[PDB]
């Protein structure tokens, strides 16, 4: 189960001070989007209500913002990815200029941010996630029926509005946030092939969402699984350990390499 | 050869449409998410159990084909393939939170979904659908004229539309449903191909697909065969059995590899 | 000559009865586009009015449909090639339930469909096609000046319409119609060249192409030399064979390979 | 030098209308079919007439430019871009002829109406080739570089495809011995994926319609056909280029490799 | 940590506004030339200015953030797109400085006013070289993951590509030692064919455009240039990128692979300078 | 600096009948677009009137077209670089019929057009422009500050419309005008790169300009630096000797290879 502590319900009133006190956009081959910050107050509010209705357990099939929210949408005529640069501008999430907040997971002393869970599939993520990491919730995405699935710590989500509202939304009140998987974006991915058989905009992506949760001072860790030939998944792997607050490498079931951005510094294994 | 309607048929009637309204689902491929009309596949269902009522229950794959029996076969309620990804959204389906409903075919056990029939051309996909599976109704798109064209149990459809709607629902009240082939959906996914030689989209769809019978409670075989080169169908294979509940291999005319996804776990081979 | 037998008037109303019962339709990369059948009675009703008129005995010259028919138009604002697949659909002409007429030609007992003339430039695909297959109409499209132009069977074309007019037209009745060629449509397919340097869809319009002809009862032989490198040439013609109903492989002015399907089965060599 | 009118050409005026005004035409390339207004060729003929009878039969080159004789020199009759689907523009090919076509005694004895190609690389003797080798009646100068074949009488400047096919089909009708150095202009522009070949696959669809153009309207025609390919691929090429034209020549090191031309005496290879 | 205003700064505010207003400035990338607002600059020069009183000459990077200043961060005054005919938008570059440029001693000794690319394969010690060895007055930072970097008080967090023009010619004209790391967000949306190097061919024009845009204006920027490039093929980019800017160092493990600087001694390939 | 010498002078007329004689224009993937010849005009009589107020001794930054004219523009809604090639036209410069004007420079007898400097980055391009040829006039476009803009031959431009203005401008007037460099239009080159890494549009453009230049007999040296792969470099050079009236190539600091159109004839080295 999931279960809502005090430690939560005081962070509450800080969550909705860090979320407006920062305007945030996103964006990736089109013009930049805001981010609708109060949906994600809107979002812990019911979460906050139904944990009162239970005994502060609750139930991730009943957490989902489909059926605690009357609209799911998180961003605010269509613009194609292959328009000037200059007409739609360049946006990036903006940088922590104070000390980012610390914690237990996925690392000791990790700052707050996204953690990238790699590796070719069957190379055991979701296991190493589930067993090693144990997240307090699990979302799913983009993945086959599973174990996982009838956890009551999984959260069944459908767009990646729902998907930063749970992990913004949770992730700042505390809670060990993971999601598996993040393909449903990856491989939507539209654009031209960089360095690695992967589109550039992606390891944007990865640093515009870490300092997202940077600033809300959540801790989050996503399966990312991309359309790489086997060879060529090491090369790739550098490349976000430069993106992200962490980076963990699944290879035959077991951690190949880690990296951790921590209050004792960077640790590489 | 015909296609018998039980009474086991008659009582899922009231619960595949009680399945089809509780979950209101989507697709979406490189462009936006499109809802799905629930009201269709429903009205399909009543049309099949009135003929089915008039017959005795023996009924030809001819007559229940969608063109015939619905007015309109529309399922889907202009936008580019290279769109910016964050002005159309992402959209998933979302998982099942409950045990999904088990089957006997096409393996003991197995989990409601989608299971890809695998091989290269003439490597014996139609051969092993048709002698080794035996499903209740076959489904034939983008296919040659061929023996199997001539069964009581095939029903010609033009559309994905009315693949859909013959998929979920016959499959839903208990029918085990193979399509041969996915060919004109799969040779008409524009885009640039990823690792593998075929477009990364290709897994996301089979997963939507897999997910969409898992919430319908349906067991469907799809012969799966996409333009790809004679010695990486063996890396395409292993990606597709992480995107589906099972994935059957054919080389030579045999079964070359399974995987399925049971209540007594995965199992390979 | 094109010679007109009491057979091929008694399936004038055959044919007739063939395009009205059931309504056709074609896609490539947009959107699926509907084809006139009156447009291929009336040019029938034409062909047999100028061969009553005349022997029986009739010119190909005279039998084009730019002169018998006041419109040559068959398909009824603009889409690109790179669209969504889901806003556009997804059509397959569908196939047929009953067991497909036989015939004489390419091969004994041939199953109603279409037959790929394949082989790399100066192969002897025209040569094979004019000495050994001796077709009764000789369809000329996007090929220069040679010997069979000067042919009393040979019928010049434009467009892609007016193939599909003759070819469903004559076919119907008995005739042994041939296409050379079919490069207009082959150089002219835009998209994304998929595994063996060809559009996955090229496979996808010879299936559609095959089935047109088998639910009208056609026998028909289009040479088919897409641009493709000289050693990747034998995977194209073993995909061809999983797309057609015959198949014939061109190479130092003879026959290299062949496969039909036929009433006593698929024969290979 | 000079372009003289015999009264062989002044007996072809009529004839040449009648093959214009008979068969509708078009042209097609990755957008939609595309009419060639006739009239237009037909006006230009007249026009070049005129001047010959002013003249004593001998002609410039620079006198019979299209730009010079016409008001308007198009030929072609909103905007549709070169990936749109084939089913929305639908497909045109320019039809084939059912009679036999008519004979030439150039670029070879008893060659059929229509295109031949002279191919080969860069500095490979194709402008060379054509001059002194082939001397044609008429040289279409196009997207070339100034050189000694600017200064003939026999050279015809133009900027325009238009312009080109006006002067081919106007010209070659009547029965002058046309040339075009070069079509660079056009294949260089030609926007489309690249085939086998590392060339535009329409580009074979091209040379097969403007072969066909010539040999319905009786026009002997060498375009000099340079397009950007590698050292190696230029054989796999000119083959398939065999495929799609009436004649076929391909030079190497300052002289001819290798020809096939298509003649009443059957195909000719070397 | 600090950046404190001299009086050196306080000087130069009048030449600044000068040599903005002198040369009317545009950029351009695949698209329509788009103009430069000049006043947007300025506006942003007074407002720093104006805190820098207020405070003791010292200020915090945090403090003079252009989206904290300005009630709009626009640098740039409908749609399009990247692969548009070049004749119907016609070609922009910003012209050269006919007389002599300003010279520096920052990123090197005598070296002319422009732009120095930092070059370097992830993780071979870009950042690190940036500030212990060169040691910038203000450090621009732009997407980039959570580092050390970000609690100094020469750090200033942008977000968009207006943001860093506006801080990098506001305060590079006036004096200061202006960095940017990273410069990712702009190079990771270059949309357009890849050139050879595995990289569009407008990233080396665009290089050249910013650098005579600090030469117009006085400015020494260090700009951190990360490219989606084969390990293979950063030899050639390097070479490449050398001739589009004043400044150019590479960098491999963790150390300085090779230099570049046009200095006012003449132009210097890796010279024996520590930064 | 740039002294107006009584030949000059006496050509201002000469120039004004060329530019009226002959209408020109220029395409790329366009559309073909007018060269407005006025503005050209009005150029020459501006430098003119400036030289006159001057001792004949004028300094390039006072001839710039920016300073001289009210409005740069030399081309007079927007057209995709991806249109159909028959929907648009195609248009190239027209040749001379007369003999071309011949030069001294940048070689002797040599005939009116352009010459292109080519060579790797850094392999003395800029060096032997202004050391070994020796330029009346260097235009300085896209390069980065040099020794060479504080040279009082350097005159500074933003716009293509720019450089044409003072290159056939001065160049019609007998100076020897240079460009360092062309990158600005080479770097933005929008299409699919032909055999060499390179756009074929390139060769056609380089012909254009050099017939531009044969017809207001201008004699311009232009430094062309494609993206281009090391060992691809010599095939390119050789392509470009086919498309310019001179080719010169730098290796090492020194001029490996020649190409001259001259009087005498074509001289290779
Ligand atoms: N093709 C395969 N054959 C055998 N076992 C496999 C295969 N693929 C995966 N496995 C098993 O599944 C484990 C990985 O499971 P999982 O965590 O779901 O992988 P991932 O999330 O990376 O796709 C492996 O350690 C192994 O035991
Ligand atoms: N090229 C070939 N040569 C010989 N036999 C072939 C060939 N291709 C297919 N076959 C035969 O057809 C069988 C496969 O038929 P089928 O099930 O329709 O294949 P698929 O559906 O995978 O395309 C093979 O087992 C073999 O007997
Ligand atoms: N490159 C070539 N060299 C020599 N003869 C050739 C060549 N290409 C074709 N031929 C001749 O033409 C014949 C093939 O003719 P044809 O059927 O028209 O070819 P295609 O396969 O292109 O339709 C060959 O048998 C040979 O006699
Ligand atoms: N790179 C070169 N080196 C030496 N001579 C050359 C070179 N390129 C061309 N030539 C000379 O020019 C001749 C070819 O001239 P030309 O007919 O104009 O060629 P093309 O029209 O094929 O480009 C060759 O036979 C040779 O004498
Ligand atoms: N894969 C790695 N394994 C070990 N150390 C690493 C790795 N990647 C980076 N480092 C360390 O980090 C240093 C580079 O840090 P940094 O300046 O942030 O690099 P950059 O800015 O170029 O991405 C290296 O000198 C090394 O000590
Ligand atoms: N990587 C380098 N290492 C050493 N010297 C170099 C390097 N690149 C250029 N140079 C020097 O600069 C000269 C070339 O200068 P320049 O004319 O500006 O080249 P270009 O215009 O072709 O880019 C060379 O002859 C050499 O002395
Ligand atoms: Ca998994
Ligand atoms: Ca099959
Ligand atoms: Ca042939
Ligand atoms: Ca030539
Ligand atoms: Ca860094
Ligand atoms: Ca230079």
Redesign the interface.
């Known amino acids: 189960p999931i279960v809502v502590t005090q430690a939560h319900i005081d962070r509450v009133g800080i969550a909705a001070d860090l979320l407006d006190a920062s305007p945030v956009?996103?964006?990736?081959?089109?013009?930049?989007?805001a981010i609708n910050t109060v949906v994600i107050k809107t979002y812990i509010a019911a979460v906050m209500e139904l944990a009162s209705k239970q005994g502060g357990s609750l139930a991730?099939?009943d957490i989902?913002p489909?059926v605690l929210l009357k609209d799911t949408a998180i961003?605010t005529a269509?613009?194609?990815?292959?328009?000037?640069?200059?007409?739609?501008?360049?946006?990036?999430?903006?940088?922590?200029?104070?000390?980012?907040v610390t914690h237990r997971w996925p690392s000791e002393g990790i700052?707050?941010?996204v953690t990238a869970l790699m590796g070719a599939?069957?190379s055991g993520k979701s296991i190493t996630l589930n067993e090693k990491l144990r997240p307090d919730v699990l979302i799913?995405?983009?993945?086959?029926?599973?174990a996982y699935?009838?956890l009551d710590t999984?959260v069944?989500?459908?767009?990646?509005?729902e998907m930063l509202i749970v992990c913004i939304g949770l992730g700042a009140l505390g809670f060990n946030v993971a999601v598996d998987s993040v393909?449903?974006?990856?491989?939507?991915?539209?654009?031209?092939?960089?360095?690695?058989?992967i589109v550039?905009?992606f390891?944007?992506l990865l640093?515009?969402i870490?300092?997202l949760f940077?600033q809300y001072d959540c801790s989050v860790v996503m399966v990312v699984n991309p359309?790489?030939?086997?060879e060529?998944i090491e090369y790739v792997f550098?490349?976000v350990?430069?993106?992200?607050?962490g980076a963990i490498l699944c290879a035959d079931g077991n951690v190949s390499r880690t990296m951790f951005?921590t209050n004792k510094g960077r640790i590489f294994n």
């Not at 799913?140 to 599973?146: C, D, H, I, Q």
């Not at 393909?183 to 058989?197: C, D, I, Y």
């Not at 359309?227 to 086997?230: G, T």
């Open positions: 956009s996103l964006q990736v081959l089109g013009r930049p989007t991730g099939v989902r489909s961003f269509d613009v194609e990815s292959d328009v000037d640069v200059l007409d739609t501008g360049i946006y990036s999430v903006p940088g922590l200029a104070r000390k980012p700052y707050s941010g599939t069957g799913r995405w983009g993945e086959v029926a599973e699935d009838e999984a069944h989500i459908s767009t990646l509005d393909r449903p974006l990856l491989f939507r991915l539209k654009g031209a092939a960089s360095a690695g058989g550039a905009v390891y944007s640093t515009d870490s300092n940077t359309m790489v030939d086997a060529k550098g490349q350990m430069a993106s992200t607050v951005r």
